[PDB]
Design an enzyme around this catalytic site. Sequence first.
Site: not given
Lengths: 134, 65, 56, 46, 56, 263, 33, 84
Positions: A3-4
């Site tokens: 997630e980033d």
Amino acid sequence: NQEDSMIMNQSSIDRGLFRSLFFRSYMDQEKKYGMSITETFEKPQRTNTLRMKHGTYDKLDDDGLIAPGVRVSGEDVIIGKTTPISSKRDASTPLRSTENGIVDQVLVTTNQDGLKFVKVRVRTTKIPQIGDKF
Amino acid sequence: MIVPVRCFSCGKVVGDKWESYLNLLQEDELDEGTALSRLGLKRYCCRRMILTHVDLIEKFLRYNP
Amino acid sequence: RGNLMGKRVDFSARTVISGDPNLELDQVGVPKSIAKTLTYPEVVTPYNIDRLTQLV
Amino acid sequence: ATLKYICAECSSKLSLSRTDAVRCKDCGHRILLKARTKRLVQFEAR
Amino acid sequence: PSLHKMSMMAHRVKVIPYSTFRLNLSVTSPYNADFDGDEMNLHVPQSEETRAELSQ
Amino acid sequence: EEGPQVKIREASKDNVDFILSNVDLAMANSLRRVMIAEIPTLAIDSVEVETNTTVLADEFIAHRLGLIPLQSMDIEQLEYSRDCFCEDHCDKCSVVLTLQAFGESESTTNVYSKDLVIVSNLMGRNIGHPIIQDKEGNGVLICKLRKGQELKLTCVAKKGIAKEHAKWGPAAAIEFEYDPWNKLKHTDYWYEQDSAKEWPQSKNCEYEDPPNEGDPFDYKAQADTFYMNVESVGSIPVDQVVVRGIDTLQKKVASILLALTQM
Amino acid sequence: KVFIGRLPIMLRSKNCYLSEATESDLYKLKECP
Amino acid sequence: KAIPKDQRATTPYMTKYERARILGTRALQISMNAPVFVDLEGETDPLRIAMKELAEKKIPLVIRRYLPDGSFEDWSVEELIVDL
RNA sequence: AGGA
Ligand SMILES: [Mg+2]
Ligand SMILES: [Zn+2]
Ligand SMILES: [Zn+2]
Ligand SMILES: [Zn+2]
């Protein structure tokens, strides 16, 4: 790295990867009051006011300035100043509470008015850490 | 800004090789790709270290005190 | 709206969030500094008396 | 020994105290710096 | 923003190093968080009663 | 000759190309890690700055100083300061280096790893000498100065390992390969038309027999025979990067054997 | 003849010193080229 | 006005909220050095002591359940079913 | 004046 987020090579970080410098310039002046009631850039002690910051004033020199070599840390007083009232009140500039670093450059100049003008740059190295954006 | 000692990725000394690299290009006239290779910079991590460096120090030296 | 339905509050903390595949669903990784700041008021009881004296 | 303030341009040392006048000697400019502590600063090489 | 009752859930503390709040990835969705630089708030109960509300 | 065998393919001051056979991958990899991370070296660790009139910051320089490779041949006879008994440091646990530079020249004055000086007493052991591999004999370029640009500083080089900081990294990249023909089926080749044409063959393909299509899959087969290349930074000679690695891992396992014994 | 206040000048304009200034002058003037 | 025991009609089961508030209450009381109605079989956390008290329905509390009109039904933690 |  889900997630980033991302995984960084600590080995590379040590080697100098993405290290940066951080400078911050604290500034102050000696304000003149009508009847030549100017302020004072000095290292003050208790001597009546008691209304003074908690940070080690002991890092200041007689001119109310830290020498440009000293490692500063808490709310350590970077600029010592006093205000007279109709007596030493405190107008000292402590290091931004959170921040830490080393005194980089101290500038002792004059205001357009002909007043004591001071600018203190404080440098730190910011190394890539676990929540740092890229 | 001043040649990095040791390549970030693998850590092979790259500090000595700057002037030597800059010279293999001016005096020896060689292309960047051969210069690096002469200097023994095999892996691209090492190659990028020198090949993409921007020796800003020189510009900084141009000011007086 | 600003001071009554909402309020700035003590015993609150805030930082950057990052995910962990080694944390349990219901847990939250708290930085040491944040734990060292936030406090819980525990009443000295015979059960906790000795633990608390050591924390003190 | 002692060089309290240094000049910004001509870089000549100044050693002045309170009420001397914030200016350089042979140079104009009212800028002036502070010259590092005589106490050595130690840094880790990491 | 807190458009859900799930935008505010109760977690177990895990004190850890490094300055970030660490969360299990499966709990990402209810909060609507990601790790592109998001920040989150933490509130600490002060009563045995208050905790019971959170845990229960 | 005994258990796992070595066959050196190419040797130099800086590199050792060899084949390791009759070994577990676990063991070749463990050794791979040990070489990178746990072999002790000597590196600059504290830097007292007397004067710095440079364009570079005190700590920027300090950092570069740590990265300067130092002779760590006899590192075995230097004590880790933490284990030493002195208030801070001494000759038994550290090498003291001095660096004093000044722009006498109108032209730019260069500050090199050669400009370092040992002020500590060495006890006749090979240690703390800045590693110069440089053709013109100058080593690492630390700084550049114009005129009144002075640099005065003192260094305390201490024994350490890469786990603490990659500055004590005695090895650069360590090359590592096994099974160049994917006989073990340890990888599933990504392709568009043919994995044979799309994926280049390695050097080591020659050193191993091709699978010959008309043969069944050897599930029995395990992984032995490892084509490696240890690159030294200069702190320790390549042979010792390997030997010391073997020794460190041995001593590491030994600690476990002893720990059981104390228990 | 008569002074009618002060006009803030834009850097690198005709009325600015730096316009006709050379690389070398700027470095002496402490300005980045 | 207070609905008589023989005329109560709210769930004979304990609501999520009732249980949470009972445990919170006993936990608070236990923590404030109140007398504990069960053997703490090594127990030290007042919530875990409270759960143990509620487990043996040895909690001397009563839920007064108010109806929209203002009347109410009193239910003992001993009598409420804990299917939660 | 910026960040999700
Ligand atoms: Mg986001
Ligand atoms: Zn490299
Ligand atoms: Zn001057
Ligand atoms: Zn010692």
